[PDB]
Design a protein around this ligand. Structure first.
Ligand SMILES: Cc1ncc(C[n+]2csc(CCO)c2C)c(N)n1
Length: 447
């Protein structure tokens, strides 16, 4: 059981890679930096809130945070004629008539730490570039899911695994030293090429080593290790407030993992109408579950008012989800539990639309229920997908079904970030529709 610790570490360290954007890429409050505002504030003695009151454009009806975050007044603050009580009052009849311009001189972020958003200025016009951080990782996942099988077929298995683990560790450490956004994106793609391949290889090894009398228990323990990795990520993110500090502390543990040492065809899946239907349903279920999981995590990261405690509470509820899945697998079945778990997540996403922002105590409960639901659904599907295919084409079908997860991971970040700008509740509407459809579709599969 000595190698069990390192094989579980291989899965625990995979958590910060796919979920670390919540802490490495947070967006703090910001406004246009102005050169003459600071001197006037020191002259008059403005408090931090009074400076925002007197300088940044107001919100107005319907929120409209765009005018305050991406625009500024072009008034010459260097003029001594400005009164300390209200400098904008004597300039015009109303503040709406003042000229506006972009933040030419930069931005001011109200945070003690840092992130990729604050360092690369991924705000306003460039705000879509933050979505590329996860899309590049998921494109790397998709390409690796094809490349790694070819590499392992034409090269030594153990040497290939060692090489991929070393590549992942080196790319993770190097990304903490990235000088610009393009190199960071390239390192992210390189890391995503090998991360999921290594995770799947470790899972396959740990399932092959253990006999049939304990395969399910170890498979569940593999996800328990991911949950423990999420908890450790939350702790490290609380301890290290800078994104470069957090990135090194995430990648370095995988280095000690190496330091511890020192024919089926694609056309087959759709040749039969029943097999075609099962393949389509499994593809849709994998896509829906991946979209729901990633979107819920990103939405929590983007809208929660207490990120650390919400993330900790959401991560913990996965463990009861794993226990419930384990109890329900051998007593009830696979179709009804999966349908119920998907319906629970869909209903939780639907309810969160109407909850008022001040009812945080209920919002966190609904979020935890939804996370437990998607966790149970994923645990069920990880067995349903595998056991619904014959042994001859089981692995190829599993790979094809899992590629839909990577495609959904590619698409998801633009749904959560960009579509929320059009309307805040729209991503939740999409998630509710997808969850309800997944609940409905699941019933068609045979028991
Ligand atoms: C991005 C992403 N990461 C992991 C999983 C699957 N998964 C592995 S461990 C775990 C939590 C315990 O069940 C889950 C959901 C997924 N579907 N999407």
């Amino acid at each position: 059981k000595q190698a069990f610790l390192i094989l579980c570490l291989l899965s625990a360290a995979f958590a910060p890679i796919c979920v670390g954007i919540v802490f490495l890429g947070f967006t703090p409050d910001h406004h246009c930096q102005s050169p003459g505002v600071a001197e006037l504030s020191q002259r008059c003695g403005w408090s931090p809130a009074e400076e925002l009151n007197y300088t940044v454009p107001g919100l107005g009806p319907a929120g409209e945070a765009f005018l305050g975050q991406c625009r500024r007044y072009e008034v010459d603050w260097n003029q001594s004629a400005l009164s300390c009580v209200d400098p904008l009052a004597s300039l015009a009849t109303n503040r709406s008539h003042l000229p506006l311009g972009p933040c030419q001189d930069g931005w001011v972020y109200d945070t003690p730490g840092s992130s990729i958003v604050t360092e690369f200025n991924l705000v306003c016009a460039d705000s879509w570039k933050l979505d590329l951080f996860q899309s590049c990782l998921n494109a790397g996942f998709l390409f690796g899911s094809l490349g790694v099988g070819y590499f392992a077929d034409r090269f030594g298995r153990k040497l290939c695994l060692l090489g991929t683990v070393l590549v992942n560790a080196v790319s993770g450490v190097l990304m903490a030293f990235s000088p610009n956004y393009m190199s960071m994106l390239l390192f992210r793609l390189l890391q995503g090429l090998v991360s999921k391949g290594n995770w799947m290889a470790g899972y396959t090894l740990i399932t092959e080593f253990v006999g049939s009398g304990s395969r399910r228990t170890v498979a569940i323990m593999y996800q328990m290790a991911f949950t423990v990795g999420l908890v450790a990520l939350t702790g490290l993110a609380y301890a290290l407030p800078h994104w470069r500090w957090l990135q090194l502390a995430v990648s370095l543990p995988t280095f000690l993992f190496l330091l511890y040492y020192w024919s089926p065809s694609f056309a087959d899946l759709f040749r039969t109408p029943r097999l075609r239907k099962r393949t389509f349903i499994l593809m849709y279920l994998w896509f829906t579950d991946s979209v729901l999981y990633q979107g819920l995590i990103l939405h929590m990261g983007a809208t929660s008012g207490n990120l650390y405690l919400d993330f900790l509470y959401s991560a913990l509820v996965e463990i009861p989800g794993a226990f419930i899945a384990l109890i329900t697998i051998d007593r009830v079945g696979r179709i009804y539990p999966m349908a119920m778990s998907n319906l629970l997540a869909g209903a939780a996403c639907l309810v969160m639309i109407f909850i008022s922002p001040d009812l945080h105590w209920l919002n966190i409960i609904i979020m935890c229920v939804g996370r437990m639901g998607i966790t149970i659904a994923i645990q069920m599907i990880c067995l349903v997908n595998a056991e619904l295919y014959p042994t001859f084409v089981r692995n190829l079908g599993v790979m094809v079904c899992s590629s839909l997860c990577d495609i959904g991971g590619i698409i998801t970040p633009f749904i959560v970030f960009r579509l929320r700008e059009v309307w805040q509740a729209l991503p939740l509407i999409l998630f509710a529709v997808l969850g309800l459809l997944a609940a409905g579709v699941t019933l068609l599969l045979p028991e």
